Symmetry: C4
Subunit: 329 residues, 4 copies
């Protein structure tokens, strides 16, 4: 029973230091990123901010707006094959900016397979388990890789670099990083297992990039600054659920105006459809109705352009290279 | 007046790191543990989570439910001989999963003696004092050991390894660890004496296991994760009061729906029935949680998940595979 | 502008470790202490817990109860000479357990002088200034010492050992230690000057005892545990205001039932009568009505007996010797 | 992506240690400070506490009070030329105690130029950008210096000493230090960029004084203790917005909700400011809009600030505010 001597930090524990540059204004900043993935060998270009594949936020209506801003949507796994066919028919321009989501079960794999065959324009797969450290997940990734050699594979979640390497070597292109921090995640309270989001991203990013692989910082961001910190720590993408919750484009009706936001393995999800899809049985919360998601997007992108300006990054690419954190109280 | 340079952590200061394993699902995990005790030489098998011997939670009704899940109940010391006789008559299947509780007083010892002679199926004794570091307690343990050489003895409470050794060498099989962190304990506020629960368990577990003895992490767990951290830190058992408070099976009626939960040495206990525990405990109104079944399932479920995530197929393996990280 | 590398702790930051002993029960513990003062050469015996010389708590009615428990009362400086005469007439058994209080003003010195000459049984003087680090205070101590060679002199406040030494060498017997922690003190908010109470007492106690002098831990205790930690850190006496506030014996009527409790240099005290008596213009608070102080005394003494039991101290004298602190979160 | 090993502290993390001295009473302390600026070569005398150039606090009505106490007011940049002319007409005694404010835009520079030409008695300029680390701001400072060689230039905001040096070498006399801590600043939340205010001042004061330059601690003070701490850490001036917010002298009428008197206080680059006025990238973040409790007349707040800083100086042994930093020793605390 060892205690790690190293203190692990989250986003609230740090700030980014401003640095000298020739960038006056935030509009000068290019947030678009180009990635060539390790295993799929595919090339991606866009603003690497991903809507999480949760029931309320990972929707086709959200994708349609996100895609307008060159942003990415991981679509929740509970849409039917027909729903995807309709989306492809009506929103072909978005298909480059979505991922189809699957658990490690036989049925999920079948359903996903059918969607991918029916919609060849979808080139991203998002794989999620309760235990991303399992040998059974490693072998599921190997299988999906072999079944879809040209699809880009997102796989999670982990918080440590050895499992990043193993999953990348096993066929995943992009590793989803985060266990505990998620707004409705409850691992810490229900299992005492987890990891601070910053330190997770810091360590895992190193490990991924040593293999020419990529990571998603998955969860923990409560504001655009955290999104900026995630990127500064080395995250190739940033995945957000809570910050996108509560908008008009979110699934659900308005309930003080509120929208319901619930974990992917929540009791609500369990009743609606998910047992060990995520590491914990997530919370169900009522979030304040934020209105149209446009305005939230603009605030996130704008704040990230400002961060880049202030650290001297003309491109989001350069952020990590120019990110220096200070520890605060 | 020295200050210890080492910072002592509680559960909220740490997390458990996940580790690579071949365990997909939490249902795979075996929470049952088999212990052979050092002094009693008895063997126990069950899920080593214990309901604290407090008035509201350490009840026969609670024990009847706990025993169905192979879990243990330390029965509060205020039940009569007749009440035990009735419980033995009606719930013989439970007797292997309960402990009879006693203070260090002559009257307590006599009453416990009568209960154990009347109910030979009860093979666990729980002893509790205000000052678990006193020589008087050491001698009382020696006496109880001598009086009941084949009963397994739980004795507390302490927070440091030297006293763990002393109590084990004096005849206790299992040492109850924790002074301060208890939900209704008030030692820190009233005496300024105490110890963080994680650091207590870390140090005390080593000390006990060096003698082939055992410990109970007693108090401080506010959620199943803490229960998991306790086990990861080396606790052989984990004892819970606050987390079992507020249920239908708890002593008391419903009072917002609430149940009353009070310290073993509280003013409420003193009026209802002095230095049983290290502090005069709090009396709190806790939210009515409903049936305890659901709570048990949450605790066990979360602990199975923990074990899955660190690669422990059995609860035995937890501490071996527990690596903690310090957090803010 | 240097930052001290050593983190300074308060009471909340530590716990006392229990230790092996032959003490079963708390009733076995003797809280009485016997002190022989350095400069006055007087001897004191009692339970070295002092009611602070504040308007509401440092009263004759309070002293009459405290004396029954062999405890001390520092009487506020706003009682008249006649009030003292009457208290000597009616409560002669208390006079050994009270101190007369004075500021460093000429009028305060005269009034105190008249009280001490009229009541020769009062053998303790309590001196207080806004700036206990002042050469002006050093010289006032010298003067009081010379005027009253056989009276025991409490002087404050400080938080550091070099001033402890200077004040003792100047003729004070007992140094009041604490600047900031007081329940209605506001130095931190109003001046940013202060010192954590535990670290104050640790460093100051050493410094005092090196000269065969004594200290009072003045302020910061919110509960009997803190009182125990004060003593554990080396405090010869412990002085309490907030903990004694709110009782039937306290000056004021009942106002939820409440009693008013206000700083010695508060706006309330300024209007009632102080300017630079204490380091900050103190708060005025409404405290919950606690009832009769007997009960509070019993809780304080009882908890301190328990502490001594748990560390193996049969006498309060032995506490610091047997006090080991652990740092907590 | 490096993490700085050094923990950076804010005001809450420290206390000032009292020290032995001959000063009994706080009235003995002289808070007035004399500065001779590096680039402007001007000499200033006063109590080096500045009202921030925000909409509600940096007013002419506030300046007229502040000046009475030899205190300084940075006037917000949205006053007209005529408004300044009227202020000069009516309050000539204050003009030495105010600064005219400008962003780095062409229109701001021209308006400020007109004000300075019309009011020659105003000898302080306050320059503020979103990114004080920009080469475009360095250049703007060089141009203002050249345009007004005898005016004293305030320029910000930064948090690090290399930018202090650059800005001073480029012609600013006084560097405004602080990014993050401001009451209605939101950089940390919106951008994740920022710096603790104490560590800012410590580092940046050293850097400025090495050049015989000066700094303002801009933002973060929530009480007079913080103000004292700022000065203790090396700040030549201390600039305050939230602490002056909510008074009778402040722009705006009293608000009345739920048995509560309040005044509105908003960021210089807030949505409120954007709607009311050319503030887009004036400051590093789009600032908050808050309702602050009505505090009454500012006189009383001033007296609390000055009184508490006199006390601080007494307790550390500083007979002059000048001596504070020399006699400031901080201790690290927990709460
Ligand atoms: N452990 C756990 N994580 C969840 C659950 N639901 C969503 N999450 C995680 O939290 C991430 C979103 O983080 P957020 O932005 O909500 O803080 C998701 O991408 C997902 O990885 C759940 O029920 N349990
Ligand atoms: N010191 C003290 N501890 C108590 C009292 N009542 C209960 N406890 C402790 O707190 C434990 C339960 O802690 P919890 O599970 O509520 O954190 C009990 O098993 C017991 O050891 C009391 O009155 N005083
Ligand atoms: N600075 C300052 N300290 C006060 C004032 N009133 C009481 N105190 C301090 O607080 C002490 C009592 O602290 P407490 O026990 O309430 O924490 C008093 O003995 C005195 O030293 C005041 O008005 N100003
Ligand atoms: N970054 C940013 N800072 C602001 C804004 N409005 C005011 N400030 C800053 O906050 C300072 C006042 O801080 P305070 O003393 O109120 O904590 C100003 O001098 C200025 O630096 C804003 O909209 N954005
Ligand atoms: K969470
Ligand atoms: K407790
Ligand atoms: K205080
Ligand atoms: K701020």
């Amino acid at each position: 029973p060892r205690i790690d001597a190293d203190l692990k930090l989250d986003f609230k524990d740090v700030l980014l230091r401003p640095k000298r540059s020739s960038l006056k204004s935030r509009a000068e900043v290019d947030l678009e990123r180009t990635f060539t993935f390790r295993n799929s060998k595919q090339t991606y270009s866009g603003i690497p901010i991903i809507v999480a594949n949760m029931d309320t936020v990972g929707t086709f209506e959200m994708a349609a707006v996100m895609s307008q801003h060159s942003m990415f949507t991981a679509i929740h796994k509970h849409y039917s094959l027909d729903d995807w066919k309709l989306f492809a028919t009506n929103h072909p321009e978005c298909l480059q900016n979505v991922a189809v989501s699957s658990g490690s079960g036989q049925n999920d794999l079948e359903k996903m397979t059918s969607i991918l065959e029916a919609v060849p324009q979808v080139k991203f797969i998002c794989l999620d388990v309760a235990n991303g450290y399992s040998e059974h997940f490693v072998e599921f990734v190997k299988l999906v890789r072999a079944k879809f050699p040209e699809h880009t594979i997102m796989a999670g979640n982990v918080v440590t670099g050895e499992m990043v390497e193993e999953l990348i070597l096993s066929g995943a292109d992009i590793i989803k990083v985060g266990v505990g921090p998620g707004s409705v995640c409850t691992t810490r309270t229900k299992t005492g297992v987890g990891y601070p989001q910053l330190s997770a991203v810091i360590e895992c990013a190193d490990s991924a990039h040593g293999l020419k692989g990529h990571i998603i910082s998955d969860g923990g961001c409560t504001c655009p600054g955290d999104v900026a910190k995630a990127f500064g720590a080395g995250a190739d993408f940033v995945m957000l659920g809570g910050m996108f919750s509560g908008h008009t484009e979110c699934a659900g009706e308005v309930i003080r105006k509120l929208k319901l936001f619930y974990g992917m393995s929540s009791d609500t999800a369990m009743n609606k459809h998910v047992a060990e899809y995520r590491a914990s049985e997530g919370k169900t919360v009522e979030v304040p109705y934020k209105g149209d998601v446009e305005n939230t997007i603009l605030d996130i992108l704008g704040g990230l352009r400002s961060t880049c300006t202030y650290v001297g990054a003309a491109k989001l690419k350069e952020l990590s290279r120019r990110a220096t954190f200070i520890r605060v109280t």
